[PDB]
Amino acid sequence: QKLIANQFNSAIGKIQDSLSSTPSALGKLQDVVNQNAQALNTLVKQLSSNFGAISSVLNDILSRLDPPEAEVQIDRLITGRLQSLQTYVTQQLIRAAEIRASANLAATKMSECVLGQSKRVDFCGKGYHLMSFPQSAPHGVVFLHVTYVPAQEKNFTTAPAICHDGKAHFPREGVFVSNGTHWFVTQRNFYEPQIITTDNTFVSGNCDVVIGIVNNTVYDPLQPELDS
Amino acid sequence: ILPVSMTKTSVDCTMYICGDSTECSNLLLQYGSFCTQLNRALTGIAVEQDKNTQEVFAQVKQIYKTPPIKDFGGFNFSQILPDPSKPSKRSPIEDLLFNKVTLLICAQKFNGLTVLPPLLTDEMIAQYTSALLAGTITSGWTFGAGPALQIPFPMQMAYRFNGIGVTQNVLYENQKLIANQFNSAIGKIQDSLSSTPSALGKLQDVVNQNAQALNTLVKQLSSNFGAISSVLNDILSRLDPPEAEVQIDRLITGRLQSLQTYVTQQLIRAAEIRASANLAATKMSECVLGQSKRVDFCGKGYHLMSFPQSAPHGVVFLH
Amino acid sequence: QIITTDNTFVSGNCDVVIGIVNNTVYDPLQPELDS
Amino acid sequence: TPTWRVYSTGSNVFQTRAGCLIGAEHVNNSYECDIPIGAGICASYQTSQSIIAYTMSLGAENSVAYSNNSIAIPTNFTISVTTE
Ligand SMILES: *[C@@H]1O[C@H](CO)[C@@H](O)[C@H](O)[C@H]1NC(C)=O
Ligand SMILES: *[C@@H]1O[C@H](CO)[C@@H](O)[C@H](O)[C@H]1NC(C)=O
C-alpha cells in the first residue's frame, strides 16, 4: 500500500512536470486552433482579388464605368467570392467529420477507460489499465491512465505438469515454476510462490500424454497430521 | 485484409493550370491564393498517409528475433516467418501477396504530377512485422505491455485456450492433433490467397481508384472548356494579349475547377483510408499483441491468436 | 455466509496488512470429521 | 546570388531514391530518425557540426532467449501514469 501509493503520487508529479515546463505535448489541441485560424485568415484575404476585373472594390467599379457593362465586372467578383465561400465551407465540413470521429473515439475511451477497467490492450494506455482520470482542456479532453508495468525478471525453469501418484496434476491458476532446486513452487504472474497442495492443482488423466511432465510430489493438506 | 495507405501525390498547381505561360501565370495570380491552399491540402494528405503507416506497423519498440532451433512442440510456421533465401527478407505468404497485387507514370509526371515515395520502404515494414510476429511466438501477451518474457510455446497456447474457456488440460493432452490442424491450415492459406477469387481485392481498389482519378484529371487537361482551343500556345500565336485574355480566362477557370474537384475527392478518400488504418491499429494491438473477447473483432469463432503479414499498401492478418 | 477455510486463503502474518480485523475462522473438517 | 552558388555545387552530394539532397553527409552509421525525408533516408544535426543523412535505424536488436522450457516471471511492478 504505501509502496504502491508512493509510486502513484510521485508519478502524478511527473505528469505535471512533463506538461508543466516547456515541453509542448499539447500539439494536437494546438493544431485545431491553428488550422481554423488559417482558414478564416485565408477567407478574409480572399477579398483583395479582382478575379479578373478592373479592381476589387465595389465603390470603385461603379464610379468609373456605366451599368450596361458594370454587371460583367460585378458578376466576375461575385463568382470569385462565391467559389471562395464554397471552398471554405467544404473544408470546414471535412474537418468537422474528423473532429466528430475523434469525439466518438474519446467518448468510448471515456465510458470504458474511466467508468470501467476495460481490458482491451492499448486502448487505455501501454500496460494493463488499473484506472484512469479525465481532465478537461481548452477544446478537448486529456486522459491520465494509471497502469501496471511489470519489470525485474527472473528466468526460472518451468514445467508443464507434475505427475505424482501415477496421475497427472495440472496447475490450477499458475504456470508451475519449478525454481532451480525444489521443483514445485506454483507462482502466478508476479512472484509469490507457494508449495503444491492439492488445492492449487486439479487432477486429470494419466502420466504419459502431456509430454514434459516432471514427477515429484503433490502435497495433500489433510491426512497425515490430523489422523485423530 | 485491410488497407493502410494511399499513394501520396501532389501536383504543382501552377504548372498544372498554366504551362510556363508567363501571361497565364500572371492572370492566375489574380485569382488570389486559390491554389496555395490546394497544394497545402494535398501535402496534409501526404503527411497523414505516412503517419497512418506509423500507427499500424510500428507499435513495437524493440526488434526481436527467433532462436536458431525450432523447438515449438510442433507448429511448423515457417510460412509466416521470414525466409533467408528470398532477397528482401520476406515470408512466403508475403511474397505471394506482393506478386498478386500489382498494377505512363513518368508521362503524367510530365504534367505536374508527382508521386512522392513512402518514408517506410517495404523492407523496413517487413522487418517490423517480422519483429512483432517473432515476439508473439516467444513472448505471448507480454511484449505489448512492459518487457518481453519468454514462455514456451506449447505452454503459451495453453493459456490462450484457458482464455477461450476450455481448461489447459485439453491442449496439453491432444497436442499432436492441434499441432497438425494448425500446420495444415497454414498450408491451405497460401493456396486460398494464391488462387484468384478476388483475394487481395480491397488492397487493389485503392490503387484502381487513385489511378483512375489521376487519369481523369490528366484527360481534363485536353478539354477546351468551351474556348477557341486547349493548348495555350495557339492562342498566344494567333492573337494579341487583349483578346487572348478571354480564352485564357475560360481555360484557367475550367482547369482550376477540375483541380478543385480532384483535391476534394482525394481528401474524402484520405479520410476513409485513415478510418481503415485506425481500425487496423486496433486490430493489431488487440488481436495480434493480445487475445480479445470481442466476437468477430478478431475473426470468426473463438480466438486463439493472430499473426500479422505485410502486403502492398496494406496489412493482411492471419487470424 | 460463515467464514470457513473453504472460501478464504492464507497468506502471511498479521502485522503487515492495515486494518486486518483478527476475529475467528471455521473449518469444514474441524467438526465431527475430527472424530 | 553567390549565396545560392554554394548550394548548387561542391563535393557534398548524396543521391537518394528521394532525390539529390545537397549539403548533407551519408555516414555509414545508423541512428533513430529525425527530420524525415523519404525512402528511409533521414537527416539531423550532429557533432565539427553538419547536417547528416543516415539510413534510419528501427531500434536496438534484441533476442528473447527462449528455450523450450523456460518461463520468465516479473518480480516487481512499476506503476506508470501516461497521458493522452
Ligand atoms: C480507519 O481509520 C481510522 C482512523 O479514523 C483508523 O484508526 C482505522 O485503523 C482505519 N481502519 C482501517 C484502515 O481498516
Ligand atoms: C562507408 O563505407 C564504405 C564501404 O564500407 C566506404 O567505401 C566509405 O568510404 C565509407 N564512408 C565513410 C564516410 O566512412
For ligand 1, say whether the CB of C18 is within 6 Å of any of its atoms.
yes
Task: With beta carbons less than 8 A apart as the criterion, state whether D78 and B153 touch.
Answer: no
Nearest to B247 by CA among B231, B258, B260, B262: B231
Cβ of D71 within 8 Å of Cβ of A145? The answer is: no
Write out the DSSP string of A75-140.
Answer: HHHHHHHHHHHHHHHHHHHHHHHHHHHHHHHHHHHHHHHHHS----TTSSSSSEEEEEEEEEETTE
| Chain D interface mutation, best of A109, A141, A157, highest count of D Cβ atoms under 10 Å | A157
For ligand 1, say whether the CB of C28 is within 6 Å of any of its atoms.
no
Chains that touch A (3 or more CB pairs under 8 A): B, C, D
Chains that touch B (3 or more CB pairs under 8 A): A, D
Task: With beta carbons less than 8 A apart as the criterion, state whether B271 and A98 touch.
Answer: yes
Distance CA B216, CA B223 (A): 11
A4 Cα–ligand 1 center, Å: 19
**Residue D10 exposure: Cα atoms within 13 Å on the Cβ side:** 15
Distance CA A8, CA C13 (A): 26
Which grid coordinates are listed for B281?
491499429
**Contacts of residue B109, Cβ cutoff 8 Å, sequence gap at least 6:** B115
Q: C13 phi and psi, to 5 degrees?
A: -105, -175
B274-B14-D19 Cα angle (round to 5)? 65
The position carrying cell 485423530 is: A228
Atom of ligand 1 nearest to the CA of C19: 14
Q: Give the resolution in Å.
A: 3.7
Please return the burial class of B163, using the count of CB atoms within 10 Å of its CB with bins 0-12, 13-18 and 19+: middle
Distance CA C28, CA C30 (A): 6
Cα dist from A183 to A178, A193, A215, whole Å: 3, 11, 9
The DSSP symbol for C26 reads B
In the PDB record, what is the listed experimental method?
cryo-EM
Task: Flag whether D touches B (3+ CB pairs, 8 A cutoff).
Answer: yes
Farthest-apart Cα atoms in chain C, separation: 37
Identify the contact set of chain A against chain C, taking CB-CB distances under 8 A: 1, 192, 222, 226, 228
> Is D71 near chain A, with CB under 8 Å?
yes
**Contacts of residue D41, Cβ cutoff 8 Å, sequence gap at least 6:** D16, D17, D18, D21, D53, D54, D55, D56
Residue D81's SS3 state is strand
Nearest-CA residue for ligand 1 atom 8 is C19
For ligand 1, say whether the CB of C16 is within 6 Å of any of its atoms.
no
Cβ of D80 within 8 Å of Cβ of A127? The answer is: yes
> Is D64 near chain A, with CB under 8 Å?
no
Q: C11 phi and psi, to 5 degrees?
A: -160, 110
Q: Which of D13, D27, D28, D30 to mutate to test the pocket of ligand 2 (most atoms within 8 A of CB)?
A: D28
A10 Cα–ligand 1 center, Å: 24
Write out the DSSP string of D6-74.
Answer: HTT-SS-B---SS---BS--B-SS-----SEEETTEEEE-------EEEE------------SS--B--
**Contacts of residue B118, Cβ cutoff 8 Å, sequence gap at least 6:** B5, B8, B50, B53, D38, D39
Helix B22-29 crosses helix B241-287 at what angle (to 10 degrees)? 70
Cβ of B285 within 8 Å of Cβ of A121? The answer is: yes
C17 Cα–ligand 1 center, Å: 12
> Is A109 near chain D, with CB under 8 Å?
yes
Please return the burial class of A218, using the count of CB atoms within 10 Å of its CB with bins 0-12, 13-18 and 19+: buried
Amino acid at C11: S
Distance CA A68, CA A79 (A): 18
Nearest-CA residue for ligand 1 atom 6 is C19
Nearest-CA residue for ligand 1 atom 12 is C19
Cβ of B152 within 8 Å of Cβ of D68? The answer is: yes
For ligand 2, say whether the CB of D28 is within 6 Å of any of its atoms.
yes
Distance CA A172, CA D34 (A): 49
Cβ of D79 within 8 Å of Cβ of A152? The answer is: no
B194-B115-A94 Cα angle (round to 5)? 95
Nearest-CA residue for ligand 1 atom 7 is C19
Cβ of D75 within 8 Å of Cβ of A153? The answer is: yes
Cβ of D80 within 8 Å of Cβ of A147? The answer is: yes
Nearest-CA residue for ligand 2 atom 1 is D28
Cα dist from A46 to A51, A74, A80, A106, whole Å: 10, 16, 9, 36
> Is D66 near chain A, with CB under 8 Å?
no
**Residue B6 exposure: Cα atoms within 13 Å on the Cβ side:** 31
Residue C5's SS3 state is coil
Write the residue in A90, A121, A210 that is nearest to B172 by C-beta.
A210
Quote the minimal CA–CA distance from A212 to chain B in Å: 10
Distance CA B45, CA A225 (A): 76
Farthest-apart Cα atoms in chain B, separation: 92
